[model samples]
Target: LLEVHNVRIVGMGEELVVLAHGFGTDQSVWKHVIPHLVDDYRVILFDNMGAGTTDPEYFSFSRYSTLYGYADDLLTILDELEVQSCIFVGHSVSGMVGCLASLYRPEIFSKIITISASPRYLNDMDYFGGFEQEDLNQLFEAMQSNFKAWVSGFAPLAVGADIDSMAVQEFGRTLFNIRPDIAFSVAKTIFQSDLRSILPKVTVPCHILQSSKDLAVPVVVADYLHLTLGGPTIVEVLPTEGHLPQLSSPDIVIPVLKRHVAGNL
Candidate 1:
């Protein structure tokens, strides 16, 4: 079981929805989605073991070393809260994490929705995750060597040309807020993980939300997940400037997400 806490709003009139953010970002990334969700869903948001300015003492690199380990934390969240039948929404790497959690306890989740996700981050014979083993190795070493310069390089590369934009700045603040070693250890895990095997095992209704323009996760990988899931799935391509669409272009993400979460029509 993982350390899980609750931040809840019960006044919402609709069904319950659970959100899990990606590797580098935190629960606040869903602020834009909240406006659409709060009116119709009992919104549940919690920081994972490391991402959400968590206490440095609580982070365990070995525990969250793999995607499944992170997924286990998500499972503990619902189990601890005793939440049954939720719409599990995840962003970036959390997509796989949440999807796996739903599979492990499908009865606990009504549906699984993933945005800007990738199953295997490296380019295989046919994959294009935008990096190689060497690149990831260098990234790990760079952070371990000089965390400051790595942060500097990561800010622009991770967010794209608009690194100085308000959204990126907020993301940078989220990243820098973490203890340096923990952040680097997390990056090593997230970028190094490849959850391609877990896709076919997914039995719950799946919704794959693709960012029409994402700096990190390629649209092709998202498409691959949709095609290979071998189960109920819907793919939506939304127009957004970057990875953190809920923050950068909430207008585009929240409405479509609302309509979909509300109903298929």
Candidate 2:
């Protein structure tokens, strides 16, 4: 399973740290932050199933149809590594993936830091999840009609960077690398998932990190997560832009990331 997921453990620090990337990218998305983490932490990185770097043949539609499937994968990876406790830093959809995993094995996570995560992407009666079903439908249609064109437009918006900027280009490259079918399935699974009911069951401490301006996750979602999460929670808004601040604005995010990972705040 480890080999299948392409898991890599770097650094030699006593405490373990797992970095779980969000949709449209693989472990490589954490490249900019890995160097800073390796100096004082044992960082574990892995490609989620359906990630472009992973063989598509390994992606079972039935097995990965929901967030729980991804959560199970995470638990299996940590168990295989014999990780008793670790800090988990999960971005976007990964934030809730970690939450579900922690509920299954609360002892495994010492802390969880979620960046641009939301329990539900669709707005409900009183909640604001940032997207309407109609919006998602259009997004899915775009992905189906022309994945490449979708990436070109979505990348810049997600990263909150200029279309030609390196961050957008980098994100676009990874987003485009995934097989269209797999990407579409994953997107449907994510945008349609509602993990709100399970949030109250997760007891691990979580630190919510959100960008001031994110096209994907609205700022209100952070506050909702902070209020709804079962564990002790704190919300910190990075004075930055984009869903992938660690990738788009590393200079502003890394220090905050380092502090959170070190449990300094």
Candidate 3:
């Protein structure tokens, strides 16, 4: 099971800090920020069932078809480790996954920091989730037609890179590594999910970190998260662009993350 997720635990601190990666990337997504954290945190990193180097055979389409399944996987990992409580820092869609997991097992999470997260990606009557259904349809079509080409183009845009920089290339590699069929299915699961109703149920203190200009999650969405979430919440709008700030702009993200965890702790 550990091999399935490629789980790794490091650092010397007593407090556990689980870093949950978002879609289309592995645990290495936290590479730049890990150094700053390890001194004070016992860091835990793992590949999601459908993302990174996780064996595709371990991916049950039925089980990973929704965020709850990922939440269950999280619980299982924690249970195996006998970890009682910890701070969970989640990125992109994993942010909501952490929220869902905390709701189901509030006792497991001492705090949750959601970076560039959204409860729903498709805009509602009054809400703006940054993408339309037609956009997702086109994305899925691109994945079906030529997944590699799609990642090559999508990576730069998603990372706010004007050119295909090393960061963009890294993202492209991770995107291409995932099975296209699974990527398509996971994309649907992420975009179609509507967890707005459950936002208020999360009792754990949440730090909503919003990127200034994320193609995936808009600033309004962060405001919505802050206003809608039912716990002690702090919203910090990062002076950066792109969805993956930890990778693209680690200097900015690392300090904020450190301060967020330290201030609360």
Candidate 4:
């Protein structure tokens, strides 16, 4: 049996809310959004293995070989806390992680919010994902060559070149802060995961928070998710750019997320 690892908790409030972040980010990515939520809802945050930069031992490529491994870790937390139902907020890949968890344990979550997620990372002729395998491979090679330089290039492309913006600075700082090898490995995983078939099975009440421009996650994936999820759904396209809306484009992202959660509950 795998042992429980590091899971961070903050704020104590009535409505329970879980924040599951995306790749190359720790729980700290929610810094800007927490203040708005702290008063009313208890907030939960954790590093997903390597991306977290928490425990070198905790971030295992072998263990987290697939997305289901993440689903397993999430379940561990739910059972440990004895949480019955809560609002689940996920960014990037965490969107599917939280969504998938809700699928296995449908009764444990009241609603799901997926921000900038792609069900399938790879692009097919019938699909419109932003990148193909060659593109992702080149990106991986670039990361392996120089991690800092890669994120410098990544930041602008991700948030539409907000190089000087606070969000870009913060995201770049965190990206450069992680160990080089860890960054490349985790990033490749994000690019490679294809959850197309899985979307048809989710039965939870779902919301897709589609960012205006995310270089990584394409808009079609969000549409596919909203259309295919096997239950009632809500899709909101935000006026943000690229991914990491809370940071790069919170001006638009923050309000949309707030409005969606309020409407759901």
Candidate 5:
């Protein structure tokens, strides 16, 4: 059943690293970065139910309607694998999922590396969360209107790689693979979630990897995470464009990740 979510362990090292993908992409999104870490750390990869080739039956709207649901699923996977402690790396929304899991079970997490994670997607009075309510409403409405068309359009923007690039194509494929009804539900759940309150309760050290220009996450969001996160936090703004640096610019993403993993900085 775990293989239904495509959980696989690769590498021979003692240190464990769990790589979790965000909304649209699956564990394959970590391919570029995996080669750099596999030799030094055992890498665990899994697909979030609605995002990858995970069995549709495993997805229950009532269960996965919120980020906590996904967080709990993470715990389930780790528990079953008998993993003691891991350095978790989550991208975009999965970053918040990792944060929530860390708060719930600090013993399972030694450190966290969040790439382009945002606590809230909507702009508040003082917070600049990049998207306004009307904008998100339009986005959700677009997804409802034509899920495939929306994904094709969103792929280039979200991945921010060349229009003909492999990264963008992979993202488009993953987005299209999801059932439209499930896609809309998951999209709504991710955008509507607010994990700001839980950040202060996290005690595990975090490494926040921020992009200088992400269409989804503003750079200021990184500062917010650094200031609001209760645990020791380090925010490094990468010189990259778009949300998926690991996919779009692995050269820039790889070194930064290795440095953190090696504790050189």
Candidate 6:
């Protein structure tokens, strides 16, 4: 199962830190942040199912129909690695996945750091999840109609960077590498998921990290998470932009990531 996910463990530090990537990207998304932490912490990185680097055949629609499957996969990966406890750093959807996993085995995660993650993306009642039904419907249609065009347009917007910048290009490369059908399914699973009901069940301490401006997750969602999570939680807005700030602005995010990993915050 670990081989299927393409898991890699680096560094010799006694402490373990797991980095879980979000949609469209793979383990390589953490390339810039890895070097800085390897010296002080043993870092683990893996591609989530349906990631561009993972074999598409391994992605089962039935298994991945909900976030619980991803959470189970996380638990299984840690069990296989004999990981008793570690710090978890999850980006976007992976953030919610980590929360679910912690609910199942709170002893496995000493701390969880979520970046640009939301419990729900669709608004209901007074909730401001930042997307309407029509917005996501159009997004799904665009992905199905022309995945290549969708990647080209969405990458830069998600990165909140220059159209010609390296960050935009890197994100586009990974997004385009995923199989079109799998990408579509994964997108639907992530966007339509509602993990808010599970938030109060998560007891592990969490540090919510949000970019000042993210195209996908609003800053308000960060505060909502801080308030709703059952564990001790703190929200810090990074003075940066983009859904993937660690990729687009490593200098600004690395120090914060390191601090959280070290439990210095």
lDDT of each: 0.75, 0.91, 0.88, 0.78, 0.89, 0.92
- Cα RMSD, each candidate: 2.2, 1.0, 1.1, 2.3, 1.2, 1.0
- Error (Å) of candidate 4 at residue 202 is 0.3
Question: Once model 6 is optimally superposed onto the true structure by TM-score, how far is the C-alpha of residue 30 displaced, in angstroms?
Answer: 0.6
**TM-score of predicted structure 2:** 0.98
Number of clashes found in candidate 6: 0
Cα error of candidate 1 at position 57, Å: 2.2
TM accuracy, model 1: 0.92
- Sorted on lDDT, highest at the top, how do the candidates line up? 6, 2, 5, 3, 4, 1
Q: What is the total number of backbone clashes in candidate 5?
A: 0
Quote the positional error of residue 139 for candidate 1 in Å. Answer: 2.0
- On the 0 to 100 scale, the lDDT of residue 246 in model 5 is 93
Q: In every candidate, how many clashes are there? A: 1, 0, 0, 3, 0, 0
Q: lDDT per residue, candidate 4, 164-208, as tens digits?
A: 877777777777777788777767767888887877788878888
Ranking by TM-score: 6, 2, 3, 5, 4, 1
Better of 2 and 6 by lDDT: 6
TM-score of candidate 3 versus the correct structure, residues matched by position: 0.97
Give candidate 5 misplaced runs (Cα > 4 Å): none
Question: Candidate 3 lDDT, tens digit per residue, 1-265?
Answer: 7767888998887778999989888898898989888889999888889985877888899998789999989888878888999999999988999999988898898899999999999988899997888998998899889988888888898888766577788887898899889998998999899999999898888999999999999899998988888888989999998889999999988998888876572
Query: What lDDT is obtained when candidate 2 is compared to the true structure?
Result: 0.91
lDDT digits (tens) for residues 1-35 of candidate 2: 89999999998877789999999988877888998
Local error of candidate 5 at residue 244 (angstroms): 1.1
lDDT of 6 at 120: 93
What's each prediction's TM-score?
Answer: 0.92, 0.98, 0.97, 0.92, 0.97, 0.98
